[PDB]
Symmetry: D2
Subunit: 295 residues, 4 copies
């Protein structure tokens, strides 16, 4: 037998950083969870018990905290590039670094219609993520994403015209609830290295905001023919609004809310056009996925 692939490192590293502007008195906090896995010439640690090739996972943990001490942590696309470059440049036998970051929301509080200078709230379990693959001689690949954006529209969604056969019982509808947890990922053109990543820094926060904006606007306004159709439209617009993206990927659960027929009780009318009370279903759920790129 032989090692065909190996990676190792440190996962679930929780990291908080504060920035204190001494002139203005205002403080800004950043919280994230980091995973760094390394590849390179490490097979002998698996096959021969040779630990001389191991940058200890503990040491990778120490490095994350140092790196966040010495550099900005925002945008995450930059922090990740810096962190991954560090490992491949610092260690000759390590040839790739894989960095994953989840950014947790700490939004500034409004207290009598005024931004408080050092108090924050988790206004949503929605995350901003990055996946950074820094590979020696191959540059820096970044996939940015948002996930856990949970939305629901109470009308202007339809699902009619779908295949029917001896497995089909679903009725066509011209009016239903649509609800989903939005997972949107946009993959950047390969960057030559850290210098190039630095050069595009302002695009990162801006493109995130755009993807979020486009997603919610299109979800809200599209008279959705299908989850398929509505996600295509989102993906299309993100590509059209930022040249440096090669692909946009959506993964959308269809979180079903079922009609409850209450006519068996005193002829109570709660279906079709009388539908007020619904049963949200925890499972199963439709899962719809689409990767869109450039013609």
């Amino acid at each position: 037998s032989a090692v065909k692939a190996a990676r190792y490192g440190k996962d679930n590293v929780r990291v908080y950083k504060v920035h204190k502007d001494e002139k203005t008195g205002v403080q800004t906090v950043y919280e994230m969870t980091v995973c760094v896995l390394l590849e390179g010439e490490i097979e002998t640690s698996y096959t021969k018990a040779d630990n001389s090739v191991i940058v200890a996972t503990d040491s990778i943990k120490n490095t994350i905290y140092i790196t966040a001490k010495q550099n900005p942590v925002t945008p995450p696309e930059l922090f990740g590039s810096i962190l991954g470059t560090h490992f491949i440049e610092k260690y000759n036998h390590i040839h790739a670094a894989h960095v994953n970051i989840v950014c947790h929301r700490w939004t500034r509080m409004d207290i009598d219609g005024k931004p408080h200078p050092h108090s924050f709230i988790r206004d949503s379990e929605e995350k901003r993520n990055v996946q950074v693959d820094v590979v020696e001689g191959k540059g820096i690949d970044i996939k940015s994403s948002l996930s856990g954006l949970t939305v629901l529209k109470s009308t202007n969604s339809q699902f009619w015209g779908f295949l029917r056969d001896e497995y089909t019982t679903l009725k066509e509808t011209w009016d239903r609830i649509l609800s989903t947890d939005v997972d949107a990922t946009w993959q950047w053109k390969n960057f030559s290295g850290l210098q190039e990543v630095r050069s595009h820094v302002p695009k990162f926060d801006a493109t995130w905001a755009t993807a979020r904006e486009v997603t919610l606007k299109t979800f809200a306004e599209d008279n959705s023919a299908s989850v398929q159709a509505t996600m295509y439209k989102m993906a299309e617009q993100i590509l059209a609004r930022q040249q440096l993206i090669e692909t946009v990927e959506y993964s959308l659960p269809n979180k079903h809310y079922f009609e409850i027929d209450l006519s068996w009780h005193k002829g109570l009318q709660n279906t079709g056009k009388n539908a007020e009370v619904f049963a949200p279903q925890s499972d199963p759920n439709g899962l719809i996925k689409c990767t869109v790129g450039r013609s």
Copy 2:
């Protein structure tokens, strides 16, 4: 042996209700999870296999959906009172109904600075809850609450002056992070019945908003001596702003963020007044609880 206490019913009943205003075109959604447990003369179902005393849990589920069909679901303090009264009035052998409701956030979306008429977002896993105990011959007890309000302030919290002995290693501090998940419960004066609950309806939403407001304002502004001291202040104000509350109860985790000493690496300065990078701790956590009422 003998049955000293028994209750039974249906838990985790997910319920969605839509309200469609046909004049304005605007739709409002309400989502909640309901638990109804009943007590009364039911011991024989346990001891004799006599099911004639069981209002089936399935039937309790059916009743929740019907009741939400026939009445408002908001405020939850009312829906719960209606639902619990139903069971004790409808069934002679059932003498108490316990209703618990968790309200999930579906906030209306802003789409180009304008409230969209039928699109919504889960902007926080924060819940609004009620606990309604409708007891035959004893009226209606309501405990309202908010939970899962996650906050953090990066300075203006201190913890100094605490007992020190041979078990103590914690250092006094005049500047630390304070972060918590706020659980605040306010218990209403016993209501005589449903008529009385209806009479106070406008107080329910208003007092919820107040508790939330007071909590975030005081968390933000208090130069906190301790979590103890800061929660007392919140509780005090909620009582002072609403006469119908008998007690206010806070339960606050202290979610510790530890300093990371990086001086072992190139004399890097990250402690005391140089503290920028912190390690959020997942466990253990301080847990602080206080019930405040009227002198």
Copy 3:
């Protein structure tokens, strides 16, 4: 306003202890999560910012580890009594200690039909818990429990004869699946203090084993008329097998598995006596509770 009730301390303290028998070479591990909350004369910390009354939560954490260093951690009913007594005896202003322990399973591995001396497996997320309330001048109250015992029987459960009215749609059945997560709690007679708790030590592990045994045996063998009826029988037997218990309490979800009617597809027969394929329901769920004590 005034403090009517207060408690504080440290929650989620993960604790591992190893015992190494040097003669036999065999090692035994114990893992648990501990919560200690204290009450006493502590109101001034809430109302006056007086921290001199606070045994720091950090220090309570340190104390748990020390106490586990200096005493057995098993049975948990003893460890908890020792830990709670410590705080009320050590500190004059602290008058109650509340100790909660969850014991995690680390079962010894069989490796070629022989107990390995130092390797272990988590064979079930089932927990053994205690709740110990050590109150100055009032002795030591212990509630022991097991929770997360997940079971299912594919036949010999019935539910017929229950109230029917205009809210009822559930059909009577003489053959159904019954599945539950068993939560069983047994409350000991108040102990005078630690000496008394020590005196009964062998009863703790033995009574736990009994409750577990009785639960699974009765769940398996009873031709259950109802969840109510089956739980009563368990509770009865636990009381009858141990004199020092005053009450036994069961809390049982009814985790419904629904028949799937497939006759709409090629007359496929999957209901009643032809029922092979079922849909496990994640929610809602019946919740059934009973406290049994002595005539």
Copy 4:
């Protein structure tokens, strides 16, 4: 823009099946959660609102239940092959089916040392999974796996000899705790189709049992130089014991248990060779991965 990749279907389909042997009276239950995603000529549903290409997710759900009605559900490698083949054979425009199954443990109860004929227990949250990719003109790829096998050994693990530099603070050790959640995946040689999958049926359950056996035996007995070294050994043996596997893949968290130095309290000795009491760490965690195949 253009669709580069698309898949859709139904996720989280909970499925229970009972087998009743009428001669012996004995009943056997199988529970699983299924995901089926389809690919093929479906782009027009995304780009043109053409739903005529959609086998409704609801219908895929119906199909899973039917298929489990008409065929065995065990081994999962077979059920998945049957289910995926169904979709590509039944529908001309659908060219791949991706089937994922998680099998939940329902182990038969021992009641007075005898297998009860219809009562079961969830003895571990450990899962058996499959990933089946049935692709038109490309046969059937199966990845089998076990996950959530949580183990711990209290000694006979070491970690010494690893790179040290200005990022390193971890001390070498010749005696530590090792604990992990084992994720082991073994990938079968591509099968020509369902006939071929049927031909190897007995290998599936047998190879699962082997992987489990090898894992626990090697975890227990290896005097582990590193998690790397210990996992390599497991993977090696699985390949050596079954010719039809092309690769074995392990993913192992290192779930750290930290020494607690208690010498600051009365010179208490709890480090090195005196280590009895440890702090299990919830995060961060080392994550170690290795794919092994044939020379």
